[PDB]
């Protein structure tokens, strides 16, 4: 049987901003995870449901690799029942999450001398996010009364903001690449296995 493209996700060279985190379904294939957990190349590997070693002997029905880039020190907010601007305005994990979070430092791949300002994130929003929902719009947030028509003048302002990802930044201030795997077990047979 086939092999799942975990290589084309974990070892893909262009992750998108956390405000527009990129979802990729994994299905109709069979691969392993106890090689990833064996790889030991990662710096944060937390499986919130089943333990990582046990899961290789399982089968899954709805696997979605979700990839984005955040700051090293804000990784704790990628967790159920969590506050933090990432988990508030950008990417909330459901409190009944059953999967794995995989964060590894990506300072060299991303942090340029002038910073990789392709990486943005939402810092303003009217309300938080229901889990696994995403906001992609880039309208100028109008907190005033008048329509400001894309002008970041008085009382209007951009909702997204950049990251100064440079090698001069601290360890926690260096960018981390984050992947999240969700293993739902619902009214369906399995398509992924070990």
């Amino acid at each position, epitope marked *: 049987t086939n092999l799942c493209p975990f290589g084309e996700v974990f070892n893909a060279t262009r992750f998108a901003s956390v405000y527009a985190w990129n979802r990729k379904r994994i299905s109709n294939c069979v691969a392993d995870y106890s090689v990833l957990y064996n790889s030991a190349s990662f710096s944060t590997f937390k499986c919130y449901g089943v333990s990582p070693t046990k899961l290789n002997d399982l089968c899954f029905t709805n696997v979605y690799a979700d990839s984005f880039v955040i700051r090293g020190d804000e990784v704790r907010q990628i967790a159920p029942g969590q506050t933090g601007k990432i988990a508030d305005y950008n990417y909330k994990l459901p409190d009944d999450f059953t999967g794995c979070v995989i964060a590894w430092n990506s300072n060299n791949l991303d942090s340029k001398v002038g910073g990789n300002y392709n990486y943005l994130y939402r810092l303003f929003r009217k309300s938080n996010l229901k889990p696994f929902e995403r906001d992609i719009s880039t309208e100028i947030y109008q907190a*005033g*009364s*008048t*329509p*400001c*028509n894309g*002008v970041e*003048g*008085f*009382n*209007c302002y951009f909702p997204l903001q950049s990251y100064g990802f440079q090698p001069t930044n601290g360890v926690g201030y260096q960018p981390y690449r984050v992947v999240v795997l969700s293993f739902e077990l619902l009214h369906a047979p399995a398509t992924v296995c070990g």
Partner: antibody
Amino acid sequence: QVQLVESGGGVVQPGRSLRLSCAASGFIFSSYGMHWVRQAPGKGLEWVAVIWFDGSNKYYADSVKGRFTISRDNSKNTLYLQMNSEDTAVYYCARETVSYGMDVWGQGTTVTVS
Amino acid sequence: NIQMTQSPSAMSASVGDRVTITCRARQGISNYLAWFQQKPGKVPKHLIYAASSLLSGVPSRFSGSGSETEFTLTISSLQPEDFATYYCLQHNSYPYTFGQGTKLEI
């Protein structure tokens, strides 16, 4: 060349009501935000109310019982009907921008409650 | 109702010098503070918004700065026309509120 043709200040009674309007000059009052501010002699500025174009309004700490705002976009006149009672103030009705940022105002309805 | 205050309720500072005026919020006003100027015979002229955005046209001798609990407005130089009453307006929470503060010369 923008301004507000303010309704002149009435001489009301303590406990009575009144109502003042401000016609627009130069700008398009149809899709701007109109603020009402009252400056009482013997005191300082005090923010009173804010009106959008799409019927969304917000009010002040003490002027949220006997005040009601409206924008007669047919006559382009931002108006309000208020109660009265400690309200003798020189009311300004400024209108908002994202660039200028409220750089045109009313001209002082000299309303007194006595 | 967030309330603000301005400690130097009046300052007698002469021409061609440098002064400051402080606003202090009894709650949290992240960055959206505005500095207004009013003179008798004139109309209030919104000088600064967002506590850092030096609005266009007005001179550069007006510089605001602060962070979410306290704010200042520095007048580095004084050509005499810049003597007036100075107010500050919070606009993070929508019930906007004002302060009190004036200027004087020796």
